[PDB]
Amino acid sequence: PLREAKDLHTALHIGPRALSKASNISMQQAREVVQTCPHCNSAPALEAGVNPRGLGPLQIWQTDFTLEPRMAPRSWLAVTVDTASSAIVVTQHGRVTSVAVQHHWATAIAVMGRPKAIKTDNGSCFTSKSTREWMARWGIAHTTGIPGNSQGQAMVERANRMMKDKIRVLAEGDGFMKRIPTSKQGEMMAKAMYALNHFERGENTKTPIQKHWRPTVLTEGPPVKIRIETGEWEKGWNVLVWGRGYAAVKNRDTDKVIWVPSRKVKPDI
Amino acid sequence: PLREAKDLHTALHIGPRALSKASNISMQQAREVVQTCPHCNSAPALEAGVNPRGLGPLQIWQTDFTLEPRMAPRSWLAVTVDTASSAIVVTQHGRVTSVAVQHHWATAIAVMGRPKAIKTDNGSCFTSKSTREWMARWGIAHTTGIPGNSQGQAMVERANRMMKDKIRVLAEGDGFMKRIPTSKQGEMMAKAMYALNHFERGENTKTPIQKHWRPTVLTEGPPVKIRIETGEWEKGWNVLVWGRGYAAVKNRDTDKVIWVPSRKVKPDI
Amino acid sequence: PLREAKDLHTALHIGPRALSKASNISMQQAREVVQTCPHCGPLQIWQTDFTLEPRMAPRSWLAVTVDTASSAIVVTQHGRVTSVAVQHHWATAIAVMGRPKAIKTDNGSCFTSKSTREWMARWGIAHTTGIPGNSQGQAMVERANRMMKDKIRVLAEGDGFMKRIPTSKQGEMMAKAMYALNHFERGENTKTPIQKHWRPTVLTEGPPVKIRIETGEWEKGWNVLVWGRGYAAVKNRDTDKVIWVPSRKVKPDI
Amino acid sequence: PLREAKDLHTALHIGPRALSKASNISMQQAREVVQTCPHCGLGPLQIWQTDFTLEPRMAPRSWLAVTVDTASSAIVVTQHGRVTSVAVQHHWATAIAVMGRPKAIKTDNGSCFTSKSTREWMARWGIAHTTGIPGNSQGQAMVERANRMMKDKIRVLAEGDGFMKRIPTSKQGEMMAKAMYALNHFERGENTKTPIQKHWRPTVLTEGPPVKIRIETGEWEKGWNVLVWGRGYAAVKNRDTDKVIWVPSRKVKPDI
Amino acid sequence: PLREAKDLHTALHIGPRALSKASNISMQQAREVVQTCPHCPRGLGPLQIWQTDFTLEPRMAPWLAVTVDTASSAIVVTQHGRVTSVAVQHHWATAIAVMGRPKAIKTDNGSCFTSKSTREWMARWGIAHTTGIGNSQGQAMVERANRMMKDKIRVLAEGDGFMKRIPTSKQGEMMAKAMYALNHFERGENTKTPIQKHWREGPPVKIRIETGEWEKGWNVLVWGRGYAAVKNRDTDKVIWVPSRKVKPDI
DNA sequence: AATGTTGTCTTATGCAATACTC
DNA sequence: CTTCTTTC
DNA sequence: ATTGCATAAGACAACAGTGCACGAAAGAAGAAGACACT
DNA sequence: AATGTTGTCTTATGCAAT
DNA sequence: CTTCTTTC
DNA sequence: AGTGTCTT
Ligand SMILES: [W+6]
Ligand SMILES: [W+6]
Ligand SMILES: [W+6]
Ligand SMILES: [W+6]
Ligand SMILES: [W+6]
Ligand SMILES: [W+6]
Ligand SMILES: [W+6]
Ligand SMILES: [W+6]
Ligand SMILES: [W+6]
Ligand SMILES: [W+6]
Ligand SMILES: [W+6]
Ligand SMILES: [Zn+2]
Ligand SMILES: [Zn+2]
Ligand SMILES: [Zn+2]
Ligand SMILES: [Zn+2]
Ligand SMILES: [Zn+2]
């Protein structure tokens, strides 16, 4: 049956259940036949990726431009968020230039303070010599991303949800439909980012401004296990941050801290 | 604090968790406040009951065109599947014409038999008076689809993902990567259709041939309950088909048969 | 330390106390650096005032707001003095700091108008007026006016702008000034205006909880440090021993 | 560990990270050791900085030709008696023999760099050359620090072996060599990798295992091999061109 | 590719594997290029055993001293003028700066390496020394370095137009082309460059092959969700196999 | 060089407190 | 006899 | 008595005729001529 | 007039031999 | 001193 | 005045 099944899959590439039933082969073997085939293994998962987040506020920032035509003429919205505090700062601009990046960054620093590093995309206004000189002056490390995959920029584009879903609702509330009047744009914006920092975020236990100015940093965390490349669970780690998607775990022997998917962490003892 | 919370949401449109905590209101009330707001319409009521299925073999067919450049210059693949037996029939054509549709349906009839009804999407070939007058002589019911949002012919469009992949796997297996030579295209077709229809489809207990020529039609099914618009569970129904996604259920008092989502059916007693 | 402080003052013109503390410089030296330059409870009561600024044209009028205890400062540029401008500046102020209790203004028309009046009722803020420019209500707001009217001028001259700041860089001047004032120390106190406002600290541990122990009882004396999927890690306050328990077995203590 | 670290610093005056790693000593101790002693950017092999310095302690061969890799911090120095068009080409030749053939080299406008002979030497090797004043910050500023590094290591080494103001000739070429081994093979500073490991890729992986990558249209394309596979990203090389690109983990799956 | 390969061999006389990889040419052509030119127990560890001997080439008139690593295949030559026991200390001094500190250096017992100055010099570096008891396995290694340096300098100098001798101003300069040709670019039919074996995995593992047998000789490089990438130690071919088909080797 | 995000949306259980049906 | 339009 | 097994979970995935069309912003690449070197 | 669908895909659970 | 390649 | 890197 094993050779007959191999020949059958060679010619027809029959799935494993059919070969297992037809030739009376156990499922592990039939699956082994599909696995050993080069063309039929065209769907392995091989998925991973952590945003990542910072262990404390004013450490990791993310910034990107988004287009909200309601703010016309200055329809470009530069959005920035701290990964630890989840607090949002936004300004309006008419053109996406490095001047707008250093201006917006100047405002966000004027509100929340100076961050350790800002994580942007591969845009031309962020990769300009002038921007590198600006962050060279303010001492902020620069981290770009994949060319076209904003998944790593997730928790800033996630902000672009609120900033665009809150501006819609608040603008419709004051009776503005096609374009927000220029006299009330500042009020709209101020109330907008006012509602998203001093007040909780749905099921969030604290407010983003409280998580900003009064963050929770564990000195030494509780012990956890992590699932390592071979699929095994390894003791000897402690967790410092455990969020919804991902957790930050620290190795006990070195104090190195890494971010891993939640599914790959379980309590140690 | 019902009015205080309402005012807070009026101005800032604060979520229910925040208003419930801030104004000490129970959950149901705060949620009612968010619900009662028009510009915060959640909504999210989109009726999920959606069922494109038929009862018996040769009763309801699905037919659509798709592009696979491996068969060029005749790369146009016409696909027709029987919704009850899941038996696929595909024919290659250089250009999508009503004559090509009548040729395809002529072959699928020459293999499976004359169907009672065929459901397609409203294209140029199907909505022509010529194809209409062709189904006229053969007595086959014609059912078009929504202009653009083709999610109902899915069990044929999904068939393309079942089809074209089995093409590639058979093409790469024979050393043909870019375009399959004209001499072996038809053999590729026959080998694909024989691999799909004459063997189990993954977890399928019967083969499409065993499901077509030896189908299983229940004289009368076991009793079930269905969840009705008000959310209640109503007795007095019997289930005739219970698949992975959807179920066909029959009303005991009238013998009227309707299709409903699996999640909306449970055993009666 | 002397060069770092000099560079810092060149760009932001930070006062001597802040540079002395930040760069570990003795008082006399840091002060000498500031000298060599030629152009050199919280959230209870606020103070608002308008001031002229022809260099910030077209939006020349600047609205300034300051807190009494935290010494914070928020500014907004406007093209003319209107009620919507006052409400905009106040919405930005409460956006950066939060909704206060009382705000002290003057007897001006923009602050005594109707559109400004009814805006106080919805947001719930108290107002106080009196003599047109008295010494107890209009004192510190003028100090802030000196703060901003000096900072914008000196920084704008420091980046190469002399007569009129271009329309693009104006907001950047705003942000740089507010950064030089909020986050930096203009007084002998080691606490910045930002520090004196939010009282920034770090949660060394979690809030107190009770945990259900093997016998089913609920025991006080624990704080929770981690709440993961399914289980929670809780720490005993008297010993710092940490154990993992099911989420269902934890509830807030008091 | 305390004696091993003391001997290592005595001879080479190795920085604290290297001594901490070599003898398994914590950071506070290594830093105390450095204290107790009195005398104490994308891809590599792309841009070099070359300049001359005059160490009077290396006389009569006082002129030192220094070339440091910008993306590796690894340096190559050779002694010369006079700065001419031949000494520069010999130094560049030795450096190329040590750390591989680069593509660009940044120097100043000296006569030894603008001569026709050296120009032809640049042309025959297919290497780029640019001028300068010098005195910039982004470029032309790394070699300046490298010169102080080299003169400092030579000074601390020769003065460590009993030579004060002039190094004996019969030992000159040695007191230079012992410097480079301390500035290339061992880690100098506070980083993790060694300046030699901070050089070339390292050991540019001729072949990786086969992968597919998801291309703009959503398709999965064969013909790539992965050279680096990190948590977020993988480095994959096209087999037909040797072009290497970085892509998200979710867009890669095993081939075959 | 034809011009790139021809130019590369003209200047450096690079072997066929290196030219094939560098210019993406199939092996038959590169071998034809090598043809067209007229003058044209080894797995312990790198940086452990060195062979050093003196062999004279008259083209560098008025000596040469070689030092080769027995694993990385790299070579270092200093071209001394007078053969003394000091030239050995300076030669090894220049070698341990490029190839690093070796764990041992073995030389055939001569009147030059057995001196007390050389022995104290060995002890000063913590490097063990053993006079060669020069072996038959090294007969094809250190002499290989000798004649490979001689022939490489001969072909480079002849290609430059210098028949008998080389100008002393160009002598120290052409030393680099030889080491660069014999160290960076690959030589012979080998796969790894002499550099790629000095600065460079599995547990190892065994893999279950199509016939069901378990084969030793593989190391695993990637273990993802479901599948593993394993590398054959001999050919360096890498294949992906199911997790169930891999187990630790020893 | 540099990784997917949470803010909500409905319905499904487990336990106090009216309002009923004997 | 062109365009013009609705679908795939 | 533990471990080989054919079943769960519990998702990923892509079918929809084809995808590349354009703009902005900042930098890189190619090209015609002026002052210095040859 | 005319309803998002399944075949794989990985890693966790119940019946019988060394 | 214009016209391409990159990315958002 | 070749021609050549440097200017724009
Ligand atoms: W034809
Ligand atoms: W033909
Ligand atoms: W034909
Ligand atoms: W004026
Ligand atoms: W004036
Ligand atoms: W004035
Ligand atoms: W004036
Ligand atoms: W003025
Ligand atoms: W003026
Ligand atoms: W004036
Ligand atoms: W003036
Ligand atoms: Zn197959
Ligand atoms: Zn609302
Ligand atoms: Zn100043
Ligand atoms: Zn020292
Ligand atoms: Zn040759």
Curated annotation (Swiss-Prot), chains A, B:
Named cofactor requirement(s): Mg(2+); Mn(2+)
Zinc finger (Integrase-type): 1-41
UniProt DNA-binding region: 222-269
UniProt feature coiled coil, ranges: none
Cofactor binding annotation: Binds 8 Mg(2+) ions per integrase homotetramer. Zn(2+) can also be a cofactor for the nicking activity, but not for the polynucleotidyltransferase activity.
UniProt domain Integrase catalytic: residue ranges: 53-216
Residues binding Zn(2+), per UniProt: H9, H13, C37, C40
Binding site for Mg(2+) 3: D64, D121, E157
Membrane-spanning residues: none
Record remark: domains: The core domain contains the D-x(n)-D-x(35)-E motif, named for the phylogenetically conserved glutamic acid and aspartic acid residues and the invariant 35 amino acid spacing between the second and third acidic residues. Each acidic residue of the D,D(35)E motif is independently essential for the 3'-processing and strand transfer activities of purified integrase protein.
Subunit description: Homodimer; further associates as a homooctamer.
Function: Catalyzes viral DNA integration into the host chromosome, by performing a series of DNA cutting and joining reactions. This recombination event is an essential step in the viral replication cycle. Has a strong preference for using the 3'-OH at the viral DNA end as a nucleophile.
Protein name per Swiss-Prot or TrEMBL: Integrase
Record organism: Rous sarcoma virus subgroup C (strain Prague)
Gene: gag-pol
From Swiss-Prot, chain C:
Zinc finger (Integrase-type): 1-40
CC cofactor note: Binds 8 Mg(2+) ions per integrase homotetramer. Zn(2+) can also be a cofactor for the nicking activity, but not for the polynucleotidyltransferase activity.
DNA-binding region, residue intervals: 207-254
Domain of life: Viruses
Binding site for Mg(2+) 3: D49, D106, E142
Binding positions for Zn(2+) per the UniProt entry: H9, H13, C37, C40
Chain ranges of the Integrase catalytic domain: 41-201
Entry function: Catalyzes viral DNA integration into the host chromosome, by performing a series of DNA cutting and joining reactions. This recombination event is an essential step in the viral replication cycle. Has a strong preference for using the 3'-OH at the viral DNA end as a nucleophile.
Free-text note on domains in this protein's UniProt record: The core domain contains the D-x(n)-D-x(35)-E motif, named for the phylogenetically conserved glutamic acid and aspartic acid residues and the invariant 35 amino acid spacing between the second and third acidic residues. Each acidic residue of the D,D(35)E motif is independently essential for the 3'-processing and strand transfer activities of purified integrase protein.
Name of this protein: Integrase
Source organism (scientific name): Rous sarcoma virus subgroup C (strain Prague) (RSV-Pr-C)
Lineage of the organism: Viruses, Riboviria, Pararnavirae, Artverviricota, Revtraviricetes
Shown residues in whole-protein numbering: 1281 to 1549 of 1603
UniProtKB/Swiss-Prot annotation, chain E:
DNA-binding region, residues: 203-250
Domain named Integrase catalytic: residues: 42-200
Residues annotated to bind Mg(2+) 3: D53, D108, E143
Amino-acid positions noted as binding Zn(2+) in the UniProt annotation, renumbered to this chain: H9, H13, C37, C40
First and last residues of each zinc finger (Integrase-type): 1-40
Cofactor note: Binds 8 Mg(2+) ions per integrase homotetramer. Zn(2+) can also be a cofactor for the nicking activity, but not for the polynucleotidyltransferase activity.
Domain of life: Viruses
Cofactor(s) it depends on: Mg(2+); Mn(2+)
Chain's role: Catalyzes viral DNA integration into the host chromosome, by performing a series of DNA cutting and joining reactions. This recombination event is an essential step in the viral replication cycle. Has a strong preference for using the 3'-OH at the viral DNA end as a nucleophile.
Subunit annotation: Homodimer; further associates as a homooctamer.
Domain notes: The core domain contains the D-x(n)-D-x(35)-E motif, named for the phylogenetically conserved glutamic acid and aspartic acid residues and the invariant 35 amino acid spacing between the second and third acidic residues. Each acidic residue of the D,D(35)E motif is independently essential for the 3'-processing and strand transfer activities of purified integrase protein.
Descriptive protein name: Integrase
Organism: Rous sarcoma virus subgroup C (strain Prague) (RSV-Pr-C)
Species lineage: Viruses, Riboviria, Pararnavirae, Artverviricota, Revtraviricetes
Name of the coding gene: gag-pol
